[PDB]
Amino acid sequence: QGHVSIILLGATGDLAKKYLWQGLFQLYLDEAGRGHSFSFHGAALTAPKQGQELMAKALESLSCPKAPSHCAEHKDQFLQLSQYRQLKTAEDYQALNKDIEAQLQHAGLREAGRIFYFSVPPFAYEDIARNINSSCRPGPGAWLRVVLEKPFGHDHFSAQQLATELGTFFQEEEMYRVDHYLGKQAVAQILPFRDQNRKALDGLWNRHHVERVEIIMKETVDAEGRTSFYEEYGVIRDVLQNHLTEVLTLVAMELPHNVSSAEAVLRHKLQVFQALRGLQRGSAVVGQYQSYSEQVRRELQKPDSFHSLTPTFAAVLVHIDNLRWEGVPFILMSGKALDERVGYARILFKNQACCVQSEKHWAAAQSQCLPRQLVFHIGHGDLGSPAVLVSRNLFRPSLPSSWKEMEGPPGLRLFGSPLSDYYAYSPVRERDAHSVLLSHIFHGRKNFFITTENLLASWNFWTPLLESLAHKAPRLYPGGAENGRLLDFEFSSGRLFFSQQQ
Amino acid sequence: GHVSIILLGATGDLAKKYLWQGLFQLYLDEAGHSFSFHGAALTAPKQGQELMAKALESLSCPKDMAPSHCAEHKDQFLQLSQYRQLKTAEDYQALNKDIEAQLQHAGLREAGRIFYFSVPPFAYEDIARNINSSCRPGPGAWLRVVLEKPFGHDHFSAQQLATELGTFFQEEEMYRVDHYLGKQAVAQILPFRDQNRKALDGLWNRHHVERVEIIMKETVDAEGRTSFYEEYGVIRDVLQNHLTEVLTLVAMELPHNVSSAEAVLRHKLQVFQALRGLQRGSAVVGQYQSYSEQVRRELQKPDSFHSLTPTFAAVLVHIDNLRWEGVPFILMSGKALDERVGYARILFKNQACCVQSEKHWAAAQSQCLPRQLVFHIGHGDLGSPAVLVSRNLFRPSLPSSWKEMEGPPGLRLFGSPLSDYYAYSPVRERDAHSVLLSHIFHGRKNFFITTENLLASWNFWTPLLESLAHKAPRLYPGGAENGRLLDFEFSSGRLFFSQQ
Ligand SMILES: *[C@@H]1O[C@H](CO)[C@@H](O)[C@H](O)[C@H]1NC(C)=O
């Protein structure tokens, strides 16, 4: 019960038009008619009338989920509630304050909060936040949940500097650092999956029961339309640091007695960040596709001849010095312009049985000589949808009513094994990442977000690898299906090396 | 070089089941060096004479060579074969005189004498000294004595029998044979490790081997053999003597050369002294449902008797070296099971991650496919001896006696198409007993059980025999019905049944 105001401070960019406006809408569509009033203040540096026209075009670009009365009433209310305003000068911020209290007077209720989504380019951060602190603070006990974007820095030093410079203005409890990959429906089912299936998996998470762990994100689309974001950032900081490390610290984490608790999850994942081996020179292998250097050459004009050392595919080996993962290797690899686009967290058990019966009667749900594995399929690939795949000989898993037993094509091969072998589950309704992330911002659930202790622990993990890998020339690959086995690699002891030397 | 071979078990069925055929094959391989062949039994001499004539009637031959030469070679072997009845020491003196008479008939020279024992063990003593007192050969000749596969039931009986027979004959002049040491791929593990010196020296580690399996599965239950089987058991008849020997063959550190034929004998004991002890949790034990009724029927036993004799046994072996400290070695054998297979499988752990798709994985280049090195020896889906090397590992190098195998497609060995393997096969199918008799005539001693290694292998299973002296076996229905009843797992250093 209370009016909640959501303001999108960023300039209307590409992803601002693509994902976020549909996200806020969907956010309005879930919680409408529950005593919560709303105000969707479009904010940018553009003209007010032109901003109103562009933002109304954005409101007309939205699509309701698959009744015409539902679409008509909710699109009319969404056109009524949302309003653009100019954000060029400092006194326009208290003009926004006047607008917010005016819309509170129209709502006739008590203020509940003020969400300030940031999407601005990183040329300036202190002026907008200091104007928010000057005027745009809320009233009687309303919270102020601001959200920052993905680029946080290039080392631990810049990340710490920006964390203190932005935590001067706002509390760290108020802030919501968004992770895209934590909103994916299979990543968000890892800890609940371990929660209602701890009776038959906690006896198997050990070092003496797990062969290997692979956290995989393959992509076919290269750096098209996104080159200038990529030459400074690199694939280690792009996906491994902010997506793969968080699912890595989600699988290898001691579960608390209440996963629904907030702070226990972050303290246990900090425990995982403290109980892991450091990274060396030889624990990582990198590559870049041949079109990347000439793409950077043709996108930015620099004198003489230039060759970029930016990694585009990377594989790292991670060991966790514990009583749980002492000998288990953890492979995190990702790259673009590969031969496939897929994403999965796959834990592979070790072979420990000899079967008296031959392969003529090796049933999928009975014998223990067929491989045992758990796959969290995030999406794409041959399956497309997100999935939870259990080997049938392990156990019968329990998943909530949001997921159901799916029936894919029989005989489809995943890691050399037929699909029929897996107990496969898929969600009963697909949801975007940003929609559930904005719903969690509105609900104030900080379990799916990043605190600065976790961010600096991640940067202290990853920075020695980055400064060691800052002078190695990567191995070129043609990309697509023409790669063959040029990027394949082995792990020997705590070191990674390519299969086919050159 | 006239050699006098005497078979002392002519009344037995195994004499003309394998031994007469092996002696005929030895003549066919070695026909000029003179030969003489004599037989002996505790049988009436006319009945013994018609019996060895009947044994000489049933003689097979290779099909490649012409039957016209086969007929005259068979007539020559019929000429050289003789029989003699033995009761008292004067009869063995007459045997020595008849041996000298055969020297004066053809080839007046004693190259040596060979004695083959096939009698039941309780008469092994006195006949032996009947050889020792009078039937010794000449000055420059040698004497060879061959004994059968039983060597007692523990280290106590093996030590007693070895010390009883060590008085008459020396270690240098005594030969011991087991049944499955004559297999050609069993005789090919050390030549394979010898030839692949540059390729396989960096892979015989703890760093690359996941597990080692040695299986000898059977589908035939002992029907009339169960009187012999009841006091012996599956551990003593195959696991103690054949599977242990192959294990030592694959686990021993290879010498400077195998042709020296002496460092092979001493490098085998280093596997024995480094083998850790066997506990009662290292073995699983089963029997089929009809074995109790089988011992109840032929042997005079009460109707409430339930034997505890094992027919199926799986044991776990750990060695403790700088090579294979944590690698498990699973030895399995059984009766009335599904597939009559015999092989020795080496499995390597999964080491690679492959970027390219599973639909584009070459059998000869992608390391994500399983790597294996299999010595198949008997009666599988192949039906022939084979040395299977997966193509992603390395290109194997076998000698001229082994050819590359043309395998039919649609064949699944260890979950993989035969194509995946670089399989090989011998040119000539030679039996085990024939090449063992050829080695007995040759005197190479690397293919025979010595006195030290026999006792070294008996005290390793005697605590397991005493530990499982009262454990009830698992009663499986037998045949193909035992799907998952006999499946087992190894947890650390323990074995347990999957089903309760
Ligand atoms: C808001 O930010 C300004 C920036 O200088 C700071 O002075 C002020 O203390 C902040 N207000 C808080 C933390 O309540």
Question: Which helices and strands appear, and what pairs or packs with what?
Answer:
The structure is a homodimer.
Chain A lengths: L2 E6 L5 H18 L6 E7 L3 H14 L6 H14 L1 E4 L4 H17 L3 E7 L8 H9 L11 E3 L7 H12 L8 E3 L11 H6 L14 E9 L15 H18 L11 H12 L9 E6 H10 L13 E6 L11 E6 L6 E8 L3 E2 L18 E8 L6 E5 L11 E3 L7 E2 L2 E2 L3 E6 L5 H11 L5 E2 L1 H17 L6 E3 L11 E4 L2 E4 L4
Parallel strand pairs in A: 1-2, 1-4, 2-3, 4-5, 5-6, 7-10, 8-20
Antiparallel strand pairs in A: 6-19, 7-11, 8-9, 9-10, 11-13, 13-14, 14-18, 15-18, 16-17, 21-22
The complex binds 2-acetamido-2-deoxy-beta-D-glucopyranose (NAG).
2-acetamido-2-deoxy-beta-D-glucopyranose binds next to helix 5 of chain A.
Protein name (chain B): GDH/6PGL endoplasmic bifunctional protein
GO biological process, one term (chain B): regulation of cortisol biosynthetic process
Keywords (chain B): Carbohydrate metabolism, Disease variant, Endoplasmic reticulum, Glucose metabolism, Glycoprotein, Hydrolase, Multifunctional enzyme, NAD, NADP, Oxidoreductase, Pyrrolidone carboxylic acid, Signal
